[PDB]
Symmetry: C3
Subunit: 350 residues, 3 copies
Amino acid sequence: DGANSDAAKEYLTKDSFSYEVYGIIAMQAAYRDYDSGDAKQDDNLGGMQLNNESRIGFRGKKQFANFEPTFIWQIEGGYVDPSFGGEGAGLGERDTFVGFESASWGQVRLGRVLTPMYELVDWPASNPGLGDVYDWGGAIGGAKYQDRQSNTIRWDSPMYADKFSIDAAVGAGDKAGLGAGDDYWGGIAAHYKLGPLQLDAAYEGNRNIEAEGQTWENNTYLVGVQGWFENGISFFAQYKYMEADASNGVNEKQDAMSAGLMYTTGDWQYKLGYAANFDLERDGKTLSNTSDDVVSAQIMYFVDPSAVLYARARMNDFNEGLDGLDDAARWTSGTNGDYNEYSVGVEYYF
Amino acid sequence: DGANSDAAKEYLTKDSFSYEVYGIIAMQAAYRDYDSGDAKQDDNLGGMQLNNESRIGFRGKKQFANFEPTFIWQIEGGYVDPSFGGEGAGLGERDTFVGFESASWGQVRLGRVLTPMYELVDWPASNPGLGDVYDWGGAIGGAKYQDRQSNTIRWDSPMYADKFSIDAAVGAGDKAGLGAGDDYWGGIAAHYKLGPLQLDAAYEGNRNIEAEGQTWENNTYLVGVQGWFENGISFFAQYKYMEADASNGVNEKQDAMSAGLMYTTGDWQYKLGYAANFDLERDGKTLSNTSDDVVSAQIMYFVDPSAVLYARARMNDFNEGLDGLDDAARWTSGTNGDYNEYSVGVEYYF
Amino acid sequence: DGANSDAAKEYLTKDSFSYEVYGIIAMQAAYRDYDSGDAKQDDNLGGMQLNNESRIGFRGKKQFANFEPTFIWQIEGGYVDPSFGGEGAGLGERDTFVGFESASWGQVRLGRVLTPMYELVDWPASNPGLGDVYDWGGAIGGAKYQDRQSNTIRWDSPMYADKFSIDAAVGAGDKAGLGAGDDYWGGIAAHYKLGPLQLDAAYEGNRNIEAEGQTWENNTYLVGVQGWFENGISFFAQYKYMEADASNGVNEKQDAMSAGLMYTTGDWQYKLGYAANFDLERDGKTLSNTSDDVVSAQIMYFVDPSAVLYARARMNDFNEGLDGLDDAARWTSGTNGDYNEYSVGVEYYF
Ligand SMILES: CN[C@@H]1[C@@H](O)[C@@H](O[C@@H]2[C@@H](O)[C@H](O[C@H]3O[C@H](CN)CC[C@H]3N)[C@@H](N)C[C@H]2N)OC[C@]1(C)O
Ligand SMILES: CCCCCCCCOCCOCCOCCOCCO
Ligand SMILES: CCCCCCCCOCCOCCOCCOCCO
Ligand code: NA
Ligand code: NA
Ligand code: NA
Ligand code: NA
Ligand code: NA
Ligand code: NA
Ligand code: NA
Ligand code: NA
Ligand code: NA
């Protein structure tokens, strides 16, 4: 089977030992206390779980004899036993790609990677534990952006003048990746280092998204700043603007923000985070109680150059629900209800 | 994505080459002869299969610079192609955990591990081929015990005075691990070395088990002995007592036993095994024909220090069926009918 | 759980470092242009995808102290992100076996391997991109052959007199592997190297195949020739004859062929391929328009001893459909409709 059967194994010279095994060992013991309005649902969803986000990966680089740009590849496994999921992950569930790099024009990757917009949403703005609100939270229809996405081509520019970089990507959408749709998206992000500050801007457009009986277009915009000061204080702040248009003329808009404050001293880092989605507006009308927010606190100990220990507490306050354009409830990260979470964890890199 | 995204890869110093790849290569060619009472069911269930229980694992240890107890981790894949199943296993389907160890207080593991009770049920008492009766066999409702279980914290004591050790564990149940329940369980085992003998006792309690339209509590108790004699004879014997209470007032009790005899000489080991479940009692009344038993013989050849070859033959005689508390047939390991199995196998450890 | 619990890990001497990690990094960017007769279906199925056929494997050999023939084993992962599928593959989805080998009598493998017949169908006769027609295409009922198959024992002879080799195999069927049937199959292939030519012949019989409310018997025969000339010209040609007999007395026949021409000069290889399935005959009557064919062109660049780059174009013309013996449509590789495909790709072996 496959594009060339096992011919590579029969005719090519094996490049023995040209790989690296790597892994992130990551365990979070997390107790969730839900307040959904239903005592049984709270008992099911809440309680103590172990969130095992350990993963194994393989990666390598190769200088082909007949081609100047260096070939790069990566295959990274999924989380081996996350909370709320069964055990076991396949290889290739996380960033998994081939590509080429050259110091002059940067790096082009093909495969499964983070979109330029999602990368900024994810880090720094989803940490610590802000992601239920800022990453995959929100009430807007269609697809505000992809996150980790297969069938993508992504270009990461060089760091021009040691100060300015661009990431650009296009790819197939989720249904298109199964031969079940013709959705697609394109995106671009830019970063500018201004001394102790970094400026970020990003865009993503999704097209031909099928949902709630309509076809959707989404456009999402993001601006952010990150900074670190000499007294050990650092911060980030991000503003995010989401627009969606359905094929029946319905328009939706929602915006969001995320901010974080960190104090690093010695082997310790203290962190506070806040994120909110504001009320969704549909066809000029504000939908009441469609906002979300989360406040988070974290203390982290640099127990080793390769590892951290941390404790975290957060409070999620979600929207009360809304209907999509087909008169059914629209799923959001608030569907299961509000909760608080107390957790301790370890992360280790080999 | 995740509790801390890809921050570990970005900010931590990679602890290169600090891992081990290990594996058990295990293949059993097994012919089954079923006598279910339906000739077509016999043809489907029976016949020759290959039972590929090979698996790959990763593990390592790390002395963190700022923390005295040693960090340990393991990620083990599932069986790559077992009999009666499709091919392919993910990483993390078997014992997969992080933990800490210190010579004074032993070892604590968090993740997916064997329960204290199941570890004794599994070894030595399920071997060779006694498991259909003694491990997952039985007629009792609820969950008599978990076996390999995610969302567990397990403490293994040191071997005090070269004689006495304890294993204790608590964890979330199966539905709770999907956010769909609040089942939980706790267990404890103790081992006492009296020269050539070892004494074993174990307990497990499961709570809030949802099954057959009821909520269940289970309590399971186990006592056993194992012995090694230098004329080459070794043996084990176990008695197991299981009780279950449903929320509609039903009580069930069942007990079981397992015994094995071994003669080891040179590169050879002969083994006989026997296990039985006795009649289930429901509400003080014994249910007739709800018992099971199995007799097994095995010859094992130590073909290498790292590997064994073995041949095995066993006869399973199962219960004749019983209803659960929702007036439908209760699934047991006897549902598919009686069978004999003849097999040869290899196991190899790298 | 398992035939021997975790006893290997507790009692056997670990053969550390007796393993190899290997991989094929394989990425194909493929644009599909469908002409199915329905514009929506054309839009869903067609478009650009990445076909990531990268996979990771583990393999090794061990000379047992007490056994002459060398022990061999392999565990190979599946495709990490193929087109039309989700991401993630388990270990063991591809060739995964244990076995023994000796220079005198060849090699026996137990586990998941290609059948002798399928190996010739796959390479050379399905390349480049002829497989939709010649590999899993075709309209005949039952199972014309297995491809990669679990529960197999396969014997590969030595190359006698440097000229003649045999592969023979038997195994359980797909439902038998789940204990849901008693299908099985046997096959044999032979190869003869006569100067610049290689001659190939193969047979496979499948029995007790359940499909379309019937039980099927299949017999498939194959003859082929491959040639390599010193001026850089090479070719292959293969003929395939398939017969099937259903348990209600219906008989079916179909034949097929595949041919390819290659010109290799320096670091370049040009390739043209053609394959066709001819009209199916059912109970002596030809069913019109049940034939398929494909024409394909490829240019391949040997970018490295370990890697190739290639570009490829093909046009698939499929049958218009047919009913099975239960009066429902019989699925074939033409069910989704005709299409053209343009692609570029890379393959790399480490
Ligand atoms: C849980 N039963 C599994 C069965 O689902 C399958 O293994 C799946 C595997 O096929 C899935 O992968 C498959 O389905 C994915 C969506 N869930 C998309 C990718 C696809 N290859 C993995 N995500 C999980 C394994 N347990 O085959 C092995 C098994 C044990 O029988
Ligand atoms: C210290 C380990 C020695 C274990 C030896 C094996 C013991 C075999 O005992 C079997 C007893 O037979 C049980 C009959 O059923 C008992 C009914 O009472 C329990 C209620 O279910
Ligand atoms: C060394 C032998 C070289 C082989 C060349 C002979 C093969 C030529 O036969 C081609 C026959 O094709 C005729 C029609 O193909 C089948 C119908 O097409 C299906 C359209 O749906
Ligand atoms: Na719960
Ligand atoms: Na989990
Ligand atoms: Na997506
Ligand atoms: Na069978
Ligand atoms: Na199997
Ligand atoms: Na369980
Ligand atoms: Na499409
Ligand atoms: Na895919
Ligand atoms: Na098959």
